[PDB]
Amino acid sequence: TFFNPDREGWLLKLGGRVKTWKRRWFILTDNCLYYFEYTTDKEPRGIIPLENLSIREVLDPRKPNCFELYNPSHKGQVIKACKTEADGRVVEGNHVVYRISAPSPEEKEEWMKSIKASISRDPFYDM
Numbered sequence: 001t002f003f004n005p006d007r008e009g010w011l012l013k014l015g016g017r018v019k020t021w022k023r024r025w026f027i028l029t030d031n032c033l034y035y036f037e038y039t040t041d042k043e044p045r046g047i048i049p050l051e052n053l054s055i056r057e058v059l060d061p062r063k064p065n066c067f068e069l070y071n072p073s074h075k076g077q078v079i080k081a082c083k084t085e086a087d088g089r090v091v092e093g094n095h096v097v098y099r100i101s102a103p104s105p106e107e108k109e110e111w112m113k114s115i116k117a118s119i120s121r122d123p124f125y126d127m
Contacts, residue, residue: 005029007114012063012101016094021063021101028114031122033069046083048098050119052126053079055112058099065108069098069115 007028012021013035024035024045033048053069060066071077081093102108119125 002027002029002034006118007111009107009111010103011035011111014063014099014101028111028118031118033115043084046081046093048079048081048093050115051122051124053119055115055119057108057112060099060101063101065102065105067100067102067108067112069100070096 005027007026009026010023011026012023014021024037025039025041027034027036027044031050033050034044035046035048036043037045048069050069052071052073054072056068056070058066058068069079071079076096079093079095079098081095081098082090083093084090100111102111
């Protein structure tokens, strides 16, 4: 599934039920954002489907080159996502939004462009 990706790279993501930044290797493919703790990891740490989502720039007090993923449909609606836990639990994410920090302004722009392009490409988008 990670074959022929639209983009791969390091990004910082702000935690949900425990708000802290974690460095994760992201892979954009099949209109989903996959993230790994380490680049050569066989299995992803989580998956964030992009369908029905939007992206916007945001200013953070400590992290630069940030943007957020959010669902426009319903107010404060929990974004559909899935993640693995060390104990083996495969649990659904509880994020209303996803604040991401890119390594540079250039990479932020590139990532925002790729994500939007992927979303608009989905033939099942906005239904």
